[PDB]
Amino acid sequence: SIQKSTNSSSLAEVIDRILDKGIVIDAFARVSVVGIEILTIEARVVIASVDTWLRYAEAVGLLRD
Amino acid sequence: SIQKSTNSSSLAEVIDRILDKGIVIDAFARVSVVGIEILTIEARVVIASVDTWLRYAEAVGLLRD
Amino acid sequence: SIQKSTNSSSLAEVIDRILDKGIVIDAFARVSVVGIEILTIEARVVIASVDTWLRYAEAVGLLRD
Amino acid sequence: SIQKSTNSSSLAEVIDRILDKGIVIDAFARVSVVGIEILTIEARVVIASVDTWLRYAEAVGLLRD
Amino acid sequence: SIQKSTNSSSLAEVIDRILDKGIVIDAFARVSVVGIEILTIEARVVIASVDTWLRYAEAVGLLRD
Q1: Distance between terminal CA atoms of chain E?
Q2: Who among B25, B30, B60 is closest to C63 (CB)?
Q3: Rounded distance between C-alpha atoms, residue A59 and residue A36, angstroms
Q4: How far apart are CA C7 and CA E65, in angstroms?
Q5: Are A44 and A56 within 8 A, CB to CB?
Q6: Cα(D35)–Cα(B65) distance, integer angstroms
Q7: Nearest CA of chain B to the CA of A39: how many Å?
Q8: How many C-beta atoms surround the C-beta of residue B30 within 10 A?
Q9: What is the CA radius of gyration of chain B?
Q10: What family does the entry list (chains A, B, C, D, E) (predicted)?
Q11: What's the CA gap between B2 and A4, in Å, rounded?
Q12: Are D31 and C11 in contact (CB under 8 A)?
């Protein structure tokens, strides 16, 4: 191709650049009464391409040893 | 590309620059009566890219030893 | 880029400069009758980027020893 | 940048300059009858950036020894 | 900057100059009948920046010895 005065790029390349960084959303909350932990919530979400989800899974320990 | 008189940058690069710094929102409250801790709340939220959520997780201790 | 006669900066850089200083909001109150501490409240909130929330957490003692 | 005839500065820098000095609001009251301290109130509030809230916390004694 | 014929200064600098002097408001009253101190009130309020509230607290004795 040829060089241009503008940097702007394609939608499919925005998607690819998002997925090979990935996203983690992570949260917890706890509610206690008189010292007893009467309610608790924990949640996590991960989104990525395969080659980066393997990075996550190999560090956390979901692949075979 | 070529140099310009203005610095302004793309939306996908704002998103990437936010996620590789990450965000932590952290809070607790306690209500006590006669010296007994009759109610308590604690919460935390984390948002990041995978490579920076691993920074958090390795310092706090969520990865295998 | 090139130098200009004005200093003004981008919204994403205001956000980044806030989060790498962080914010702490901290309060307590106590109500006592005849010498007995019949009611008490304590609360704290913290907001930061990951690299500065780790500063807080390492000084207060939330990371593994 | 270049020098100017006026000193005026940005809103984000006012906020930063407030938070790295911090604010303490501190009060108590006591009501006594026949020599017995039948009612009492105490309250405190602190606001700062992380690096200055640590100054407060290290002098008052909220960090690990 | 450059020198001018007038001394006037910014609102954020008025606030800073107030808080690093601080304010103390202090009062008590006592009502006695036949020689018995049947009612009494005492109150205090303090406002400052952190570095000057520590001056108060170190002289009165609220910091660890």
Answers
A1: 46
A2: B60
A3: 33
A4: 47
A5: no
A6: 61
A7: 10
A8: 17
A9: 20
A10: Belongs to the gas vesicle GvpA family.
A11: 8
A12: no
Q: Which residues of E touch D34 (CB under 8 A)?
A: 36-38
Burial class (CB in 10 A: 0-12, 13-18, 19+), D30: middle
B7: nearest Cα among E53, C28, C7, A24: C7
Give Cα separations from A45 to A25, A27, B44, C10 (angstroms): 5, 9, 15, 30
State both tokens at B20: 């590789």
Strands (DSSP E) contained in chain D are 23-33, 36-48
Nearest to E38 among D7, D23, D34 (CB): D34
Amino acid at A59: A
Question: Cα–Cα distance between E26 and D45 in angstroms, integer?
Answer: 19
- Select from E44, E45, E55 the least CA-distant residue to E21: E55
Bridge partners, B46 (sequence order): A26, B24
Residue E17 carries which side chain, given as an amino acid letter? Answer: R
- DSSP string over chain E: ----S-----HHHHHHHHHTT-EEEEEEEEEEETTEEEEEEEEEEEEE-HHHHHHHHHHHT-S--
Nearest CA in chain B to C14: B18
CA B22 to chain centre: 5
Cα separation, E5 vs D5, whole angstroms: 12
- Domain ranges across chain E: 11-60
Resolution of the PDB structure in angstroms: 3.2
Tokens of D15: 């906020």
B23 and C20 in contact (C-beta within 8 Å)?
no
Chain breaks in chain E (C to N over 2.5 A) after: none
State whether E46 and D29 contact (CB < 8 Å). Answer: no
The structure was resolved experimentally with: cryo-EM
| Nearest chain C residue to B14, by CA | C12
d(CA A61, CA B4) in angstroms, rounded, equals 47
